[PDB]
């Protein structure tokens, strides 16, 4: 069977960065040519492997993670990076082996009044471990007073909404990001 790569890129709706989606690519043959010869992408950066050598390489599994962020934050999807996205939403390991592909989605994820469905985690006490997904909606305690589940001063909802408007600048415009991670394990390989 052909590898399920179109079902991640051609997807109708993308996930929020705090709840980034992961798909396990297995038991298929992969043709990465649908990717490196495409001009929709503004970022195609591969670490630990060459895109040209991917066709002749085999991995036990592949992991395709998808989310939507701001353009000014796409730089944060890279090893050894800091920021709200890299620290509290999606953290890549320093020894990352895989590719990061990002394209503009102002025609898809923007609304005239502002698309408020895409959310990012704003408040978190500690940085995210690599490939960690935090979906907690617990009220953030910014002081010594316990929140008891009610919002207010020093008691803030952890998730904030991107306002994605077509009139926004490139730095405030929505960008769809897919991160492919190639996993080689002591197991029968299923992706080639």
């Amino acid at each position, epitope marked *: 069977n052909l590898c399920p790569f179109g079902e991640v890129f051609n997807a109708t709706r993308f996930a929020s960065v705090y709840a980034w989606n992961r798909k396990r690519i297995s038991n298929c043959v992969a043709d990465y040519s649908v990717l490196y010869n495409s001009a929709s992408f503004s970022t195609f950066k591969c*670490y630990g492997v060459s*895109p*040209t*050598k991917l066709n002749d390489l085999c991995f036990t599994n592949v992991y395709a993670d998808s989310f939507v962020i701001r353009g000014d934050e796409v730089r944060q999807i890279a*090893p*050894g990076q800091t920021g709200k996205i890299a620290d509290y939403n999606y953290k890549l390991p320093d020894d990352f082996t895989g590719c990061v592909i990002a394209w503009n989605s102002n025609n898809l994820d923007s609304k005239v009044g502002g698309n408020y469905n895409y959310l990012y985690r704003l408040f978190r006490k500690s940085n995210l471990k690599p490939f960690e997904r935090d979906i907690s909606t617990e009220i953030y305690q910014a002081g010594s007073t316990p929140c008891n589940g009610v919002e207010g001063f020093n008691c803030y909802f952890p998730l904030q909404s991107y306002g994605f408007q077509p009139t926004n600048g490139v730095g405030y415009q929505p960008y769809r990001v897919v991160v492919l991670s190639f996993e080689l394990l002591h197991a029968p390989a299923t992706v080639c």
Partner: nanobody
Amino acid sequence: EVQLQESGGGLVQPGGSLRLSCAASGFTFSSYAMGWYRQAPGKEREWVCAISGSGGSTYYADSVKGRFTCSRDNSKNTLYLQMNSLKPEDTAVYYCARGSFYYTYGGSVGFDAFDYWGQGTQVTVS
């Protein structure tokens, strides 16, 4: 607590040799790739070289190829740029940084540096 410092610069005659050293702290030196940059006065900073933590893969700019060799001694947590067969076009302040190698659409290789800067004495070839 990451810090990195450079040394070895000075005034040198054209055609000479000089070695610049980048000492590292706050991280495992072998784990991360390190690169050499030059900020020429009046231009933009240009990437000179970068070396993998293993040292097996080293990438050099075409300007400095065949004359400058980049080496690392992970035992001493140091990065070296062997500036030999020097030329007056090689006068600049040189900097080292941590970073990650990345491959582009066609297999081209680039070096992306983690943000940092270090005060250094200008390397002048005269």
